[model samples]
Target: MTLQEEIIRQLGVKASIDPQEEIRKTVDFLKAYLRKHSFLKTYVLGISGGQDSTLAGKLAQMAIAELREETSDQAYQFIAVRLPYGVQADEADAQKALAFIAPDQTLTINIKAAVDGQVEALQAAGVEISDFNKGNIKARQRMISQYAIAGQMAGAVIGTDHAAENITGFFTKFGDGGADILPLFRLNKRQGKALLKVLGADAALYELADEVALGVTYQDIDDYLEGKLISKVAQATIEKWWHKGQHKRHLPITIFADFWK
Candidate 1:
């Protein structure tokens, strides 16, 4: 069996989809999710200027627009928040994404201050944390910032994770992994990139190729996920990541007494 097939046999999520149908379905799904909640007036997301968030933001903006057009109910908004460490290296790309997304309002929250303050406190307490730990703190702080905005506005957080990330567990738990809804959950990396093109996203976003920030090439990931041929080395690498990151894919592990014990 193919690598993707084996993963699918376990995870039960289709690795392939019709681009047009998937976008339409995801847009409709967002609309329905909001409609069902009824109390949520805003759809909030962290805009990282990457392919996934840009696509998710665009989808959300379209959904909110349609929701407004179809009804004369309460006012709805799409709030795209930029959670930067300080001065993000790719702020220009972020601005380009925001320009393309054209959200109702954009908020910029610098997290370096908060992360540094916390790290200082931890060091004061005799805890020595490395840059990796600081990085995770930065991610969690971004979610905290997003949740704070969502809470004040009575909105839901939009997650940018896709099938590739999901199966490989390539997100920080309770950080970027936490969201009120997932429009990109069913799509693979390649498919998500295609959705961005369909939305008429700027060529720079793709051509500059800043979106593939992961260690592995998206082609290997997409190929493996599509049950297509992949190099043994690539397959091994992908599987290794998926195995090591499994804890990130689910709720906290718990212990229970055995029924027979």
Candidate 2:
């Protein structure tokens, strides 16, 4: 297969999708997975007010609500947790997302203390880390908080990861990438926005912060994933990250042993 075809297959992106139909399929997938794993009673997700998380959060809420109604089981619920490092600059957007999601439960966990504590300890041990790595600590801490809540509530943590982010490996491993379920899998950035638009989300919530960090627009990423032609610069940037982030997309490596074989 060509590189574009290979990447498209790996990331599970389709050439096109119907937003409404995709939403139905994702919600049904969530419900079916939860039913299969009947031990889990709730869906937990971190809402960052970004299009990806907002879309995933809303879908989880819908799935849980429908599950409860269909099974007549009031035990099922969706918890939307706010994991802010100190003070989030886009707090208003997050509030908008929470209002749109209307989850069964909402919890806020300020990760500043934990993140600072870890950074301080690392520095005290004479291990210097960059601000970017420090930011990753915040992401991992957020996942830790979500998992803590999930464990206590008999729930599974939901991830907002989809084809766009997956292809670029934009998420921190075992951090924002850590989750029990991914409702937005195989959907690109524009596709996610489409889901939100159909769900009546505010136009402001569709704005994404990832472009600033990735130095690549969602349009470029979406185009690349769909096997469409893009500029050489955009394609090079995407491929660079796609190659660099290969490790993040896989499990820990194991040594090969000829004797064992």
Report the number of the highest-TM-score candidate: 2
Each model's lDDT comes to 0.83, 0.89
lDDT of each residue in 1-261, candidate 2, tens digit only: 777899998788888889999989999999999999979999999989878889999999999999999999999999999998887887988999999999899999999999999999999999999988997898999999999999999999999889888888999999999998888889988888888888899999985467877878889999998899999888988888888788777777668533222
Q: Compared with the true structure, what per-residue lDDT tens digits does model 1 show for residues 1-261? A: 655677766554565667788789988999999999988989999998878889999999989988988886547999999899977786998999999988998998999999989999999999999987887889899999999999999899999887778777778888899888988886777788777777788987755232244556777877777777788877787887777777776566667633222
* TM-score for candidate 2: 0.94
Q: How many residue pairs clash in each candidate?
A: 0, 0
Clashing pairs for predicted structure model 1, backbone only = none
The predictions' CA RMSDs to the true structure, in order, are 3.2, 2.8
After superposition, the stretches of candidate 2 with alpha carbons farther than 4 Å from their true spots are 257-261
**Alpha-carbon RMSD, candidate 2:** 2.8
